[PDB]
Amino acid sequence: LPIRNIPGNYGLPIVGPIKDRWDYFYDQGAEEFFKSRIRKYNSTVYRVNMPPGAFIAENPQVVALLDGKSFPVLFDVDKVEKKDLFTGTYMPSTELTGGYRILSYLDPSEPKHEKLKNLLFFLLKSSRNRIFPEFQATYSELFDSLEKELSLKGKADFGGSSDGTAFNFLARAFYGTNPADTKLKADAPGLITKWVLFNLHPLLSIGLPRVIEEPLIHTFSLPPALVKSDYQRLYEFFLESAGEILVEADKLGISREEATHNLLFATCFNTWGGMKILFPNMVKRIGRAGHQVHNRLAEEIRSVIKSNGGELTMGAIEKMELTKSVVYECLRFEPPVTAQYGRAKKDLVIESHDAAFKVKAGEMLYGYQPLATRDPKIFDRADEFVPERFVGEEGEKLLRHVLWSNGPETETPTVGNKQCAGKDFVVLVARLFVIEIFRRYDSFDIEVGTSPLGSSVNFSSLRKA
Numbered sequence: 103l104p105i106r107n108i109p110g111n112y113g114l115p116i117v118g119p120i121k122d123r124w125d126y127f128y129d130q131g132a133e134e135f136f137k138s139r140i141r142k143y144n145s146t147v148y149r150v151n152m153p154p155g156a157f158i159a160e161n162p163q164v165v166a167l168l169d170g171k172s173f174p175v176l177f178d179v180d181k182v183e184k185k186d187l188f189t190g191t192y193m194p195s196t197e198l199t200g201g202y203r204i205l206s207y208l209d210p211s212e213p214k215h216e217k218l219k220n221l222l223f224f225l226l227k228s229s230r231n232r233i234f235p236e237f238q239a240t241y242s243e244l245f246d247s248l249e250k251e252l253s254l255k256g257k258a259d260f261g262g263s264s265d266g267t268a269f270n271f272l273a274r275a276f277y278g279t280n281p282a283d284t285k286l287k288a289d290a291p292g293l294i295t296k297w298v299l300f301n302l303h304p305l306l307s308i309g310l311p312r313v314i315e316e317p318l319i320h321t322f323s324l325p326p327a328l329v330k331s332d333y334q335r336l337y338e339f340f341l342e343s344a345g346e347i348l349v350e351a352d353k354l355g356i357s358r359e360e361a362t363h364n365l366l367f368a369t370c371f372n373t374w375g376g377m378k379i380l381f382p383n384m385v386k387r388i389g390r391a392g393h394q395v396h397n398r399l400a401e402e403i404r405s406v407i408k409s410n411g412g413e414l415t416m417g418a419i420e421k422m423e424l425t426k427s428v429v430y431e432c433l434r435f436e437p438p439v440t441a442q443y444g445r446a447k448k449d450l451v452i453e454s455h456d457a458a459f460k461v462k463a464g465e466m467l468y469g470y471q472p473l474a475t476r477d478p479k480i481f482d483r484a485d486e487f488v489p490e491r492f493v494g495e496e497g498e499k500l501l502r503h504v505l506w507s508n509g510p511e512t513e514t515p516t517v518g519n520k521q522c523a524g525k526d527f528v529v530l531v532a533r534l535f536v537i538e539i540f541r542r543y544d545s546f547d548i549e550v551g552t553s554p555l556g557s558s559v560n561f562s563s564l565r566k567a
């Protein structure tokens with residue numbers, strides 16, 4: 103491939119980044135922000151300013167990678183450093199996390215990265231026999247509540263009930279603890295939501311006019327002191343509930359305090375927060391796929407469970423070809439977390455589809471994942487949600503290009519890489535979610551709106567089996 107100069111520029115000091123921020127948040131939105139520049143520069147690799155800039159991030163300047171050939175450089179731990187860039191060009195204060203640099207911020211060259219990721223592998227493995235029954239019990243209560251709400255109001259707000267459900271499910275599945283039996287009661291979602299806001303506010307819009315939003319959430323960090331007592335309630339819950347896991351933390355050579363802050367973060371931020379984005383998104387996309395798809399899913403799921411003597415098991419799920427494919431297609435079409443960063447460790451040559459680009463050691467690389475996973479040079483019908491895309495031997499090959507986990511779907515997270523520690527768990531619970539829907543309902547209708555993180559979704563009809 104021909105070597106091309108990386109196009110784009112960062113504009114003037116101060117005002118360049120501000121104008122780009124306004125495009126990103128207000129005047130274009132993320133997807134068009136990136137696509138308009140791909141068109142202007144005739145390139146899927148270019149220089150751009152990223153939020154937050156201002157007084158939050160020292161340096162907004164990145165090289166953006168917006169196709170599925172160049173993007174995977176971001177997984178290569180021999181090419182990029184992954185230290186303190188979980189959230190991009192700024193890092194939330196460690197005051198927000200008990201004074202520790204939590205696992206998600208650690209480069210694999212740091213010894214505690216290996217220890218803490220092993221702790222999480224253990225948490226997940228040791229929960230294996232509680233996941234199915236607790237998911238089935240907690241999500242059954244959710245759909246009960248949504249039917250109730252639909253009957254009263256003519257619509258049922260998914261997110262406002264499902265957030266409680268997700269935390270209850272995680273407390274019961276991971277820690278054998280029902281939050282209702284603790285001092286947290288039903289408060290966890292509100293507590294976690296406020297704390298996540300204090301971490302992520304520089305990257306989000308809450309729909310307020312820019313004249314209010316810009317000085318309030320886009321210019322300076324929100325003070326960690328204001329969420330410390332809320333965080334303390336969560337900390338004490340984990341300290342008191344995570345006993346069996348903390349025994350393993352002890353064997354792995356992790357202090358009780360460090361392990362507890364990490365368990366808090368993995369459960370509340372990575373898992374519950376990731377589920378808060380994914381599940382409403384899935385409901386939106388599957389809803390849009392229409393009633394014929396719903397009926398095919400119902401028929402497959404119910405038939406397979408019946409073939410399995412009414413017992414839902416991991417083996418039964420392997421038989422549900424459309425269900426598996428629909429979950430992967432949700433993850434491809436709409437990656438729940440769109441922003442991955444890495445800093446070049448050395449001089450690199452990054453290949454795209456039609457040219458190669460040289461980057462210098464120290465340059466911040468950035469990828470907007472949806473442009474890599476809807477790359478029309480890799481996927482046919484790239485902008486179409488195709489339920490059956492991954493069905494069959496040939497369909498399954500394309501999974502190497504599904505990147506939601508910060509690595510190919512065909513790869514495994516390890517202590518040596520920065521791929522999502524909960525990769526298998528996420529795919530499993532997404533499957534169980536679809537199963538629980540279509541074992542109960544033939545089809546459904548939805549109303550949809552925007553949310554700071556993912557999607558706001560109401561059910562307007564739930565057609566019972």
Ligand code: HEM
Nearest residue numbers: 205206222372373376377380438439508519520522523524
């Ligand atoms: C739908 C839910 C989830 C989504 C969308 C998601 C997504 C991601 C993504 C995109 C990253 C890469 C971060 C980066 O840019 O470096 C990541 C990393 C990570 N995730 Fe997940 N995740 C989810 C659930 C979970 C679960 C269940 C766990 C349980 C352990 C988990 C633990 C982690 C950890 C520890 C990392 C950092 C990995 C490392 O340092 O090597 N996540 N996740």
Ligand SMILES: CCCCC[C@H](O)/C=C/C=C\CCCCCCCC(=O)O
Nearest residue numbers: 188189298371372375376438439440441
């Ligand atoms: C509330 C968000 C929880 C997602 C946790 C998941 O494990 C990984 C997150 C990885 C990067 C941190 C930044 C997350 C910002 C999400 C909103 C904007 C976007 O999609 O990039």
